[PDB]
Design an enzyme around this catalytic site. Structure first.
Site, short mmCIF file in Angstrom:
data_model
loop_
_atom_site.label_atom_id
_atom_site.label_comp_id
_atom_site.label_asym_id
_atom_site.label_seq_id
_atom_site.Cartn_x
_atom_site.Cartn_y
_atom_site.Cartn_z
N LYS A 66 -11.30 10.40 -3.23
CA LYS A 66 -10.97 11.70 -2.66
C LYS A 66 -12.16 12.37 -1.96
O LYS A 66 -11.99 13.44 -1.39
CB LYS A 66 -10.39 12.64 -3.73
CG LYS A 66 -9.11 12.11 -4.33
CD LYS A 66 -8.68 12.95 -5.46
CE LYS A 66 -7.49 12.35 -6.15
NZ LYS A 66 -6.90 13.26 -7.16
N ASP A 88 -5.33 19.06 -16.81
CA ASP A 88 -4.28 18.97 -15.81
C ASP A 88 -3.58 17.62 -15.83
O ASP A 88 -4.21 16.58 -15.75
CB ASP A 88 -4.85 19.27 -14.43
CG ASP A 88 -3.86 19.13 -13.29
OD1 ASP A 88 -2.67 19.50 -13.48
OD2 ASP A 88 -4.25 18.63 -12.23
N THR A 119 -4.71 16.80 -8.82
CA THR A 119 -6.05 16.66 -8.28
C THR A 119 -6.93 17.79 -8.74
O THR A 119 -6.50 18.92 -8.81
CB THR A 119 -6.00 16.61 -6.73
OG1 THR A 119 -5.25 15.47 -6.31
CG2 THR A 119 -7.38 16.59 -6.09
N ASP A 142 -11.63 13.97 -8.89
CA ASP A 142 -11.02 13.02 -9.83
C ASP A 142 -10.50 11.79 -9.02
O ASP A 142 -10.73 11.70 -7.80
CB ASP A 142 -9.93 13.68 -10.69
CG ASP A 142 -8.60 13.84 -10.01
OD1 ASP A 142 -8.56 14.48 -8.94
OD2 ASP A 142 -7.61 13.31 -10.55
N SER A 201 -4.07 15.37 -12.75
CA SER A 201 -5.44 14.87 -12.60
C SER A 201 -5.78 13.83 -13.66
O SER A 201 -5.23 13.88 -14.76
CB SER A 201 -6.44 16.01 -12.75
OG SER A 201 -6.24 17.04 -11.80
N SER A 212 -4.43 20.89 -8.19
CA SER A 212 -3.68 21.37 -9.35
C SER A 212 -4.57 21.68 -10.56
O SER A 212 -4.21 22.52 -11.37
CB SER A 212 -2.58 20.40 -9.73
OG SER A 212 -3.10 19.10 -9.97
N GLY A 271 -3.91 18.17 -1.97
CA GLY A 271 -2.69 18.53 -1.25
C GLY A 271 -1.91 17.29 -0.90
O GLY A 271 -1.85 16.35 -1.68
N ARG A 278 -7.15 10.25 -9.61
CA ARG A 278 -5.73 9.98 -9.79
C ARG A 278 -4.86 10.44 -8.64
O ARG A 278 -5.01 11.54 -8.11
CB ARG A 278 -5.21 10.57 -11.12
CG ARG A 278 -3.67 10.65 -11.25
CD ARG A 278 -3.21 11.36 -12.49
NE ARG A 278 -3.61 10.62 -13.68
CZ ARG A 278 -3.42 11.04 -14.93
NH1 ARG A 278 -2.83 12.20 -15.16
NH2 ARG A 278 -3.83 10.30 -15.95
#
Ligand SMILES: *[B]([O])([O])[C]([C]C1=[C]OC2=[C][C]=[C][C]=C12)[N]C(=O)[C]1[C][C]2[C][C][C]1O2
Ligand code: NA
Ligand code: NA
Ligand code: NA
Ligand code: NA
Ligand code: NA
Lengths: 204, 242, 223, 243, 199, 240, 236, 229
Positions: free
Chosen positions: C33, C166, C1, C17, C169, C129, C47, C19
């Site tokens: 999100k 990332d 994320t 994002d 993500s 992340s 998280g 995903r």
């Protein structure tokens, strides 16, 4: 792993004005097959079904405790539950055990009792919901099912097209998983009817 | 007023709580206690009637040490009074545990008065049959004298009296310009006022109780030493003749 | 994320994002999100997905009760307090990393709330992340009092740096622009990865699946 | 405080529980409610007390409550007390089904709620539930069943019974025309219409529900206005043939 | 973190760095670790951020109600015991060190350490991961009788010295001067820091 | 009409009244005092009698004005210990609000909360309502100066001007005539109106020590209690 | 009477009738005497027998090596209060390894017995005690009452016709502090005798003696052990 | 606490404390509810004893959630208890089912709270009758919940002072096919029947409920409706 103790696979797939839900039929404890006809898909309405993979004891407890809350709901409300509401009800049930969870990852498939628009979703063991417009998978062969589903799924499939897609995605996925199989059961849910079929599957 | 007077959770038709007024009657029916705030501290005096010659000197004390810097003078039902001294002690101890210093007297009075108040709201418990005074001396706070009654009321005073001759002792205290007097001179006056309000006819005998907390004692609440008490008792008896 | 936030001239912009990964396997390509708290208060979550979902839901619910009772528009510091004190009691076991952005009678505010119950008020922040990719883009080009269009551009770039850099993500960039006149939810503001089409000619002729059992249950009787 | 204590769970000098008896007095004022057991089904026919031009019809019924897949009930007394008890009947039924994965046998659901009503008359210092209930159901042990329960937590199984307004008059009227083992729900519906017509006829003031078995599944249905009117006219035309 | 507090005649000076770090990652580079507990009472936060903020909030709440019941601003000793009692009651579950300093009409400017639930009044005190590298510096540079400006200078030099040696300290320096007159908040930016040997 | 225990406990009488709540309103007047609160363009002021009949009292401890928060103050009318208990509760609720919500409790919310606590006494039989009345003042960030009052009944409301105590009915009849006239409600006009409302209603020419005044301004929103000198300043202006 | 049945109810005269009724329980029980010298604290009691064929009820109880009590009132309440005193004494030796100061034990009795006098449905302890003890402040005679009040005494008497005993004790008060143990016990027995009618006299069956002092732990003398103290005076 | 019921059956089978609570409602200020074809109106007499009352400080017509609203007759302080509990209950339903509470479901949950206060120890019933409005399937909803815990779905109804006459007035003016704007007009007319004095937009309060949700009418909107009266 706790989820691989019994194994199993569950998947749901959206079509044009219809939904499909499929599961394997094995009941095993580690490498030992015990039963080849274990129920993993439970009806929650005329056009609404829940698929539960994971630890067998918790698949049975979650289905029974969900049926309890659903019966009280339809009695108080005097109406059949909507697919999204059954998802929220499962989320609340699973999240209540956030720090000692049930080892099951549900899959929900149905048609709205008023709008008839197809609904598919899945939840993790602690009740996080995920709605998709194509397919959802849960089980010890989730990678195998994702590969089959990603390749075979098409947008507006007719009941017969959907039946072949979900059947081939399940059959070929569970045939690369040691602890899933012993047959596959598929439910095609249409406005007018429910078609239930068991497939000729590998028995090893 | 009959009917509406059995419970502290019941108001009479005219907006009164009779159980609290009856608890005040037990204070009025009790012996007199006085407290006077002066320039350098607070002095307590109690008319302690002797019920029997068999009792020891100092028995049924009506003056208490509630904290090292705080004193308490009571009037009314003595078991209730001692129970309130223990509440005040525990309250003062709790303040020291939480903040690391001696409880300010106005705060101790507010805290204790709210326990007293809590006993005036329900049928489950009865109001305290007690009125008491809290005296203290600090360099940052000065001399402080408070008085709490059965209802839960707390007020600051220059002069104060509770019991039988509450109004009789008040007109005698008013004759003093205590704001410019010291503890050493005020003790004489306290013993004097007690000897005036005492009823030789109705009560056979009494013992004088004297306490003080001030600049002289270094903010400590303690008994007035025997010598200064004897001098105050001689002056009170000599001023009773003339 | 990759979730990011930014305070500009007339408000705040929240970015995220789309995903959701289940241990190195992409489960959801299009998840939301950016969560609603109050009409002018939104929250990005990262998280443990269930913890972020239920904690945002709980504070939105407490904020509706707070606004109904007070009769006033809710404050951003109230959602920060409620979130903080709930997360602190759980000692980090409720794995919600949140970015709370909003507009109240005191102006635009941005906060970072951590699973243990710690927080910070900031002009810009990133969590998840992919937070360092987003944070590098923000540190590189953030300037105070940016215009809506300049701040939206920086936010899309910051979330995109995380999407591409990332592994945890991906998908699209969703954004939420909060100003004094409400909030504009820009669902799929940008798609860094253009439609990856293919010759997906996978059709099964009816009858290729061997069936052993068949039962048809009609529902036309109820209809 | 003993001065204010009502003493609801104490005995009277004649071994009487007065709060229970006073609760029974309330039940007499509620709408007439009857139940008739037949060979092919069960029925509940109740007088509707929510009759008013400005009342909106939002619910399926007024006094008929589905409890489980094979059971339904009707009430007579304090309606809010009936909502408490009917909700508990549903919880008891779901708890039995969760435990044994079989529906709660009719009598067992009745005794369970009755034990709660009984507790209210022995301890707690609380007023009893001012409700009398009529239960209709089916089970694999005794088939079609009819039950009655009182504020006392007392119950009995019946072939035909009545609770509420003019209960005694309706019971003796049932006692006259009920034929044991030879009742069909067609003849029981005519007896329900006949008894109600004397103890109170229009479809607006009546509410009927039947419990039948169709294809190994229980069917619970409240009659439509058109259906109730056919039964009213069939009774009126039977009296018109006697003249 | 590097936190510091100095007593002078008529008040206190408190300083902190601004770095909040999760291991090697600087999560916040401009965090103000000086929190008001009352009008003239502040605390310096170090250790666990969640614990430090939780303790600071409960202490501020306890002290607000204390000040209202007492009709006076709380003593710095009362604030010191409020923080200390919390840190001590929960010493196994808390991992923060809140230095408490401020002004009183009773004892004036005072600095208190509440390390692990203990209570000590100090002429000056240092805390945080960065304090380790400046023990010798504060022992060599501290002089009794410093003026408010000399205390600010000392706190700034000591905190800048720690910020340069400690990976867990950095950013800007936040200063707070509490006197009977009120509180002066001040910021020394990361470019305007005092320079020393740095090779 | 009465039936059973409806005059002893908080249960309905045959007319649907709560006699015990009605008696709690009569307990407010037992104290003999009267309070007035007036709201202005940029302020809110509270005034009440300060009767120290004994020189033996420390007059500084004899008050009915209390500071709830820095920016919220109140005047209590009724039973003294009940009032001091209610002020203590108000102080706790206000502090607790800031702890949980991170902002200062609005005056209407504090009043609503105290009124809600009071309603419990009105419905539960084991305890009596408090024989007291709370009037709070404060400056709202969005809404300006506020005057709120709550009852032993659990009722609460916002007001342009209000009164409590022995002469509540007479003070409200004075204030509603004065509010109907054309006024540019300055601090001076809001303070004088409150003083001459209490003075005309009690038929008493006040002395500085005979009354007490509390105030909140948009310029200085911290609750401020007036000194004998500041009270005297307004008294000598009214003499003209 | 409406202010008669509850301790929480104050009468319009500022009286708690339930406390005053509990005080009567002490007056109904047999008389007991407690007195002291500079070295000894003595308790003397009249033991009442329900019949010639029944034994005389224990009036004197052991609390600790340095404390003993004499009871008057409900015996179950006396047992309950004695057990409380014994535990409080035990805790003091467990924690401080030192005997509990007698005046501090009496304060605990006052706090403990006051609690039920202020709570609804609760009742006062219907018992009065005379407490003999010896500590760093020498010997003591304390009196506890159902009202929760307590007294430090030079001597005391409680129970049926105890006013007679108090008249004797008030007269000989002056002699008590210098008496030797035999002279002190004799004074207590004479005070006890005054309560008794002119027909009956003190025998080895209705006399109980309790003694604690500088050299003596709390000891109870009852039948043959009472004989030495009885022989001395028999006039009136 | 008192653990015994304060509401008990009389020898004639009556719960006299609930009958006396209904007398408190009957003495309360009038309240009207009208369920139009495309919405619901709630109107009440918000008459204040003096001009000194800051009229916009407290409200009688209250929102429960975005699509549910309330009004009452009887005890104002008791009402606030039920509003807080109703708002709370609606949030619990939303957290679990992620869908706004159906009006009938909220009414049932609030009626249960009211029933508790007729049986639970040491409490008297609420001296309030509520009028709850809502929109959920594709239709408006109007319910009454009285002190015993019983509820009723209404097309139109009146509560409080002169309620029996208000209901007759509504009986002859109700049409199932009314528009929300026409129902607002006849709701103010029902109040006018028993209103003593000159009705202004400050001594009456109106709330509406439709597909857009529940909201209070501003005094400007109430002024425009009173302009045609
Ligand atoms: B310091 O000792 O390195 C520091 C204290 C600090 C920093 O930010 C805050 C915020 C609130 C109170 C104290 C505080 N510690 C940290 O920065 C760490 C980062 C995070 C993980 C451990 C601790 O909290
Ligand atoms: Na899954
Ligand atoms: Na396999
Ligand atoms: Na195999
Ligand atoms: Na550094
Ligand atoms: Na009450």
């Amino acid at each position: 792993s706790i989820m691989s103790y019994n194994g199993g696979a569950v998947m749901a797939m959206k079509g044009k004005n219809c939904v499909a839900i499929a599961a394997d039929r094995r009941f095993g404890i580690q490498a030992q097959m015990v039963t080849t006809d274990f129920q993993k898909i439970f009806p929650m309405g005329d056009r609404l079904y829940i698929g539960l993979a994971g630890l067998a004891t918790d698949v049975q407890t979650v289905a029974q405790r969900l049926k309890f809350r659903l019966n009280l709901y339809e009695l108080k409300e005097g109406r059949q539950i909507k697919p999204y509401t059954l998802m929220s009800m499962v989320a609340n049930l699973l999240y209540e055990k956030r720090f000692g969870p049930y080892y099951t990852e549900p899959v929900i498939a149905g048609l709205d009792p008023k709008t008839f628009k197809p609904f598919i979703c899945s939840l993790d063991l602690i009740g996080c919901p995920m709605v998709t417009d194509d397919f959802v998978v849960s089980g010890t062969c989730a990678e195998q099912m994702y590969g089959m589903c990603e390749s075979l799924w098409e947008p507006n499939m007719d009941p017969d097209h959907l039946f072949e897609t979900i059947s081939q995605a399940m059959l070929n996925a569970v045939d690369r998983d040691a602890v899933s199989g012993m047959g596959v059961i598929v439910h095609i849910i249409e406005k007018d009817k429910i078609t239930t079929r068991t497939l000729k599957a590998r028995m090893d | 007023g009959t009917g509406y007077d059995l419970s502290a959770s019941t108001f009479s038709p005219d907006g009164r709580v009779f159980q609290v007024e009856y608890a005040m009657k037990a204070v009025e029916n009790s012996s007199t206690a006085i407290g006077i705030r002066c320039k350098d501290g607070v002095v307590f005096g109690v008319e302690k009637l002797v019920l029997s010659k068999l009792y020891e000197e100092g028995s049924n004390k009506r003056l208490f040490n509630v904290d090292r810097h705080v004193g308490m003078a009571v009037a009314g039902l003595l078991a209730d009074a001692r129970s309130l001294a223990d509440i005040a002690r525990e309250e003062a101890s709790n303040f020291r545990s939480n903040f690391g210093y001696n409880i300010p007297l106005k705060h101790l009075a507010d805290r204790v008065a709210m326990y007293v108040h809590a006993y005036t709201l329900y049928s489950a418990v009865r109001p305290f049959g007690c009125s008491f005074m809290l005296g203290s001396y600090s360099v940052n706070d000065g001399a402080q004298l408070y008085m709490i009654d059965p209802s839960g009321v707390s007020y600051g005073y220059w002069g104060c009296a509770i019991g039988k001759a509450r109004q009789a002792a008040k007109t005698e205290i008013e004759k003093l310009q205590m704001k410019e007097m010291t503890c050493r001179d005020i003790v004489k006056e306290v013993a004097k006022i007690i000897y005036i309000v005492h009823d030789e006819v109705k009560d056979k005998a009494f013992e004088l109780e004297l306490s003080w907390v001030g600049e002289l004692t270094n903010g400590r609440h303690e008994i007035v030493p025997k010598d200064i008490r004897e001098e105050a008792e001689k002056y009170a008896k000599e001023s009773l003749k003339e | 994320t990759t979730i990011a936030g930014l305070v500009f001239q007339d408000g705040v912009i929240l970015g995220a994002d789309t995903r959701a990964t289940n241990d190195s396997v992409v489960a959801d390509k299009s998840c939301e999100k950016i969560h609603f708290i109050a009409p002018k208060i939104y929250c990005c979550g990262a998280g443990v997905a269930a913890d972020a979902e239920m904690t945002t839901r709980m504070v939105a619910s407490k904020m509706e009760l707070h606004a109904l009772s007070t009769g006033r528009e809710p404050r951003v510091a109230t959602v920060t307090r409620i979130l903080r004190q709930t997360l602190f009691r759980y000692q980090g076991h409720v794995g919600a990393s949140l970015i709370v952005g909003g507009v109240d009678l005191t102006g635009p505010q941005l906060y970072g709330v951590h699973p243990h119950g710690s927080y910070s008020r900031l002009p810009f922040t990133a969590l998840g992340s992919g937070q360092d990719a987003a944070l590098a883009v923000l540190e590189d080009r953030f300037q105070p009092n940016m215009t809506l269009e300049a701040a939206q551009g920086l936010l899309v770039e910051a979330v995109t740096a995380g999407i591409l850099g990332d592994l945890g993500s991906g998908g699209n960039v969703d954004a939420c622009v909060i100003t004094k006149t409400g909030a504009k939810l820009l669902r799929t503001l940008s798609s860094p990865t253009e439609p990856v089409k293919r010759s997906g000619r996978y059709h099964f002729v009816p009858g290729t699946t061997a069936v052993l059992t068949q039962t048809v249950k009609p529902l036309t009787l109820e209809l | 405080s003993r001065r204010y204590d009502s003493r609801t769970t104490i005995f009277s000098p004649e071994g009487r529980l007065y709060q229970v008896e006073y609760a029974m007095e309330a039940i007499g004022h509620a709408g007439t409610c009857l139940g008739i057991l037949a060979n092919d089904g069960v029925l509940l026919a109740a007088e509707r007390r929510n009759i008013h031009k400005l009342l909106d019809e939002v619910f399926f019924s007024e006094k008929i409550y589905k409890l489980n897949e094979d059971m339904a009930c009707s009430v007579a007394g304090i309606t809010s007390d009936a909502n408490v008890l009917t909700n508990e009947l549903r919880l008891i039924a779901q708890r039995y089904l969760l435990q044994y994965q079989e529906p709660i046998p009719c009598e067992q659901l009745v005794t369970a709620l009755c034990d709660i009503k009984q507790a209210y008359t022995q301890f707690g210092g609380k007023r009893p539930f001012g409700v009398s209930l009529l239960y209709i159901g089916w089970d694999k042990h005794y088939g079609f069943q009819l039950y009655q329960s009182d504020p006392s937590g007392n119950y009995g199984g019946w072939k035909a019974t009545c609770i509420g307004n003019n209960s005694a008059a309706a019971v003796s009227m049932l006692k006259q025309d009920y034929k044991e083992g030879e009742m069909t729900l067609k003849s029981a519906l005519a007896l329900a219409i006949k008894v109600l017509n004397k103890t109170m006829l229009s479809a607006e003031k009546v509410e009927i529900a039947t419990l039948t078995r169709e294809n190994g599944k229980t069917v619970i249905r409240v009659l439509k206005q058109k259906e109730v009117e056919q039964l009213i006219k069939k009774h009126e035309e039977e009296e018109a043939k006697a003249e | 973190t590097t936190i510091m507090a100095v007593e002078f005649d008529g008040g206190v000076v408190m300083g902190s760095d601004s770095r909040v770090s999760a291991g090697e990652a600087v999560v916040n580079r401009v965090f103000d670790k000086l929190s008001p507990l009352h009008e003239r009472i502040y605390c310096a936060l170090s250790g666990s951020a969640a614990d430090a903020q939780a303790v600071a909030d409960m202490a501020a709440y306890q002290l607000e109600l204390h000040g209202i019941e007492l009709e006076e601003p709380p003593l710095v000793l009362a604030a010191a015991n409020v923080v200390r009692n919390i840190s001590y009651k929960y010493r196994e579950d808390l991992s923060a060190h809140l230095m408490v300093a401020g002004w009183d009409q009773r004892e004036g400017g005072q600095v208190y350490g509440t390390l692990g639930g203990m209570l000590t009044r100090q002429p000056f005190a240092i805390g945080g991961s960065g304090s380790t590298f400046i023990y010798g510096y504060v022992d060599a540079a501290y002089k009794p009788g410093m003026s408010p400006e000399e205390c600010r200078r000392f706190t700034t030099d000591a905190i800048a010295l720690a910020m340069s040696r400690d990976g867990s300290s950095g950013g800007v320096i936040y200063l707070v001067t509490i006197t009977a007159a009120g509180v002066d908040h001040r910021v020394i930016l990361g470019n305007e820091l005092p320079k020393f040997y740095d090779e | 009409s009465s039936a059973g225990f409806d005059r002893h406990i908080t249960i309905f009488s045959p007319e649907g009244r709560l006699y015990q709540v009605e008696y709690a309103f009569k307990a407010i007047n037992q104290g003999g005092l009267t309070s007035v609160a007036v709201r202005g363009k940029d302020c809110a002021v509270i005034v009440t009698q300060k009767k120290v009949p004994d020189k033996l009292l420390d007059s500084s401890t004899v008050t009915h004005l209390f500071k709830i928060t820095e920016n919220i103050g109140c005047v209590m009318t009724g039973m003294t210990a009940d009032s001091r208990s209610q002020v203590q509760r108000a102080r706790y609720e206000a502090a607790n609000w800031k702890y949980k919500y991170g902002y200062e409790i609005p005056v209407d919310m504090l009043c609503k909360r105290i009124a809600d606590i009071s309603q419990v006494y009105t419905q539960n039989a084991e305890m009596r309502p408090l024989g007291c009345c709370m009037i709070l003042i404060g400056i709202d960030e969005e809404q300006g100066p506020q005057v709120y009052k709550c009852d032993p009944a659990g009722y609460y409301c916002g007001f342009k001007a209000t009164a409590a105590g022995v002469k509540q009915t007479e003070s409200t009849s004075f204030l509603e005539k004065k509010v109907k006239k054309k006024f540019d409600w300055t601090f001076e006009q809001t303070v004088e109106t409150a003083i001459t409302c209490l003075s005309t209603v009690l038929s008493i020419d006040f002395k500085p020590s005979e009354i007490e005044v509390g105030v909140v301004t948009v310029e200085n929103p911290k609750f401020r209690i007036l000194t004998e000198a500041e009270i005297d300043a307004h008294l000598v202006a009214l003499a003209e | 009477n409406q202010y008669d049945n509850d301790v929480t109810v104050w009468s319009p005269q500022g009286r708690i009738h339930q406390i005053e009724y509990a005080m009567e329980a002490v007056k109904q029980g047999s008389a007991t005497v407690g007195l002291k010298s500079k070295t000894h604290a003595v308790l003397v009691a009249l033991k009442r027998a329900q019949s010639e064929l029944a034994a005389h009820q224990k009036k004197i109880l052991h609390v600790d090596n340095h404390i003993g009590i004499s009871i008057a009132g409900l015996t179950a309440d006396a047992r309950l209060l004695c057990n409380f005193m014994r535990q409080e004494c035990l805790d003091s030796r467990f924690v401080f390894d030192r005997p509990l100061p007698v005046s501090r034990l009496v304060s605990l009795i006052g706090s403990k017995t006051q609690i039920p006098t202020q709570r609804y449905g609760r009742r006062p302890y219907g018992v009065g005690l005379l407490i003999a003890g010896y500590d760093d402040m020498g010997p003591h005679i304390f009196q506890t009452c159902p009202s929760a009040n307590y007294f430090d005494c030079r001597a005391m008497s409680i129970g049926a016709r105890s006013q007679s005993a108090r008249t004797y004790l008030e007269r000989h008060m002056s002699e008590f502090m210098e008496c030797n143990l035999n002279e002190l016990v004799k004074h207590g027995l004479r005070a006890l005798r005054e309560t008794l009618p002119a027909e009956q006299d003190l025998t080895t069956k209705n006399v109980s003696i309790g003694i604690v002092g500088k050299d003596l732990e709390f000891t109870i003398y009852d039948d043959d052990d009472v004989s030495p103290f009885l022989e001395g005076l028999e006039e009136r | 606490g008192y653990s015994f019921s304060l509401t008990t059956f009389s020898p004639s089978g009556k719960l006299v404390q609930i009958e006396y609570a209904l007398a408190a409602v009957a003495g309360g200020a009038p309240s009207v509810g009208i369920k139009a074809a495309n919405g619901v109106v709630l109107a009440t007499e918000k008459k204040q004893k003096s001009i000194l009352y800051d009229e916009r400080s407290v409200h009688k017509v209250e929102p429960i959630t975005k699509h549910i609203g309330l009004v009452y007759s009887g005890m104002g302080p008791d009402y606030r208890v039920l509003v807080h509990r109703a708002r709370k209950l609606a949030q619990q339903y939303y957290l679990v089912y992620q869908e706004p509470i159906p009006t009938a479901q909220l009414v049932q949950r609030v009626a249960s709270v009211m029933q508790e206060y007729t049986q639970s120890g040491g409490v008297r019933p609420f001296g309030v009758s509520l009028l709850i409005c809502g929109w959920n399937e594709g239709r408006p909803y109007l319910f009454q919940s009285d002190p015993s815990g019983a509820y009723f779905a209404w097309k139109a109804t009146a509560m409080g002072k002169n309620y029996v006459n208000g209901k007759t007035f509504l009986e002859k003016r109700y049409n199932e096919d009314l528009e929300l704007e026409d129902a607002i007009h006849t709701a103010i007319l029902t109040l006018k029947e028993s209103f003593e004095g000159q009705m202004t937009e400050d001594n009456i309060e109106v709330g509406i409920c439709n597909e857009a949700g529940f909201r209070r009418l501003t005094p400007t909107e109430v002024k425009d409706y009173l302009a045609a009266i």
